[PDB]
């Protein structure tokens, strides 16, 4: 996160750390949507151009964390994955279209003050909140600068930007399975997700039922906190049917 602040304890209890077994290292963020399912970006697991192709045995999920690096002895819970599910039409070849994946834990995690799931948006929630100008919140333990790493979980509030502005800031072909967020050069406030934040949640708080909803996944960007550039996120509601689908068929 670039130009964010440290998160308060329990501010983002659905925050998940994707953790490599060996070398032990942070892979990406993720989010807890139930006691057994985790949501992340498909690219965190599979990205052939970079020779990335992680399997279940390759990883650990860490939940209830605050510190980036310490094992948070009676707070964080570590789980193993039962199975990974990537969107069948994920596009790694051209633009990361449909960048989404689900991970089902081996065993269901217990909720606590620091461990609690986020809600998945419904048609109606999506429709009122996913509006240009409306702010969402991103969290992660990624880089503080484009070019280091926080000690603790960072947060930044950023405005959703109009589709045209998104399109015209880049050469990549933008799809309806994506949205962009950030401040405009004149807007005079900064912040972005940065390396190490991928797969994490973009959430919004409903003013109607005052519950937190996950609207996006940190997906891609060009640099971090650059003028006239924006971070791109998977549009969670648009892929909701595939999500529903896999949970109905494989678990829950």
């Amino acid at each position: 996160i670039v130009e964010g602040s440290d998160a308060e304890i329990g501010m983002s209890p659905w925050q998940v750390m994707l953790f490599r077994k060996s070398p032990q290292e942070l892979l990406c963020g993720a989010s807890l949507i139930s006691d057994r399912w985790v949501l992340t970006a498909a690219h965190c697991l599979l990205y052939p151009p970079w020779d990335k192709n992680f399997t279940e045995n390759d990883l650990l999920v860490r939940i209830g964390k605050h510190s980036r690096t310490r094992y948070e002895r009676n707070i964080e819970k570590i789980s193993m994955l039962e199975k990974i599910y990537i969107h069948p039409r994920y596009n790694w070849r051209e633009n990361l279209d449909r960048d989404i994946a689900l991970m089902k834990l081996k065993k269901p995690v217990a909720f606590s003050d620091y461990i609690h799931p986020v809600c998945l948006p419904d048609r109606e929630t999506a429709a009122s909140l996913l509006q240009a100008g409306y702010k969402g919140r991103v969290t992660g333990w990624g880089n503080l600068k484009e070019t280091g790493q926080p000690s603790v979980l960072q947060v930044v509030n950023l405005p959703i930007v109009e589709r045209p502005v998104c399109k015209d800031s880049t050469r990549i072909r933008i799809t309806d399975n994506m949205f962009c967020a950030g401040y405009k050069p004149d807007e005079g406030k900064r912040g972005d997700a940065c390396e190490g934040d991928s797969g994490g949640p973009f959430v919004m708080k409903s003013p109607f039922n005052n519950r937190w909803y996950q609207m996006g996944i940190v997906s891609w960007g060009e640099g971090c906190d650059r003028d006239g550039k924006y971070g791109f996120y998977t549009h969670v509601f648009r892929l909701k049917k595939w999500i529903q689908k896999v949970i109905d068929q494989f678990g829950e």
Binding site: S5, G10, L120, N157
Partner: peptide, 29 residues
């Protein structure tokens, strides 16, 4: 557990607000 989804134990559940959530709500004009 989505049912209790999106209500934080240390915030929503105790009717405590985090330090910046009002910036979010003040944007949903």
């Amino acid at each position: 557990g989505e049912a209790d989804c999106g209500l934080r134990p240390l915030f929503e559940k105790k009717s405590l607000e985090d330090k910046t959530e009002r910036e979010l709500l003040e944007s949903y004009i």
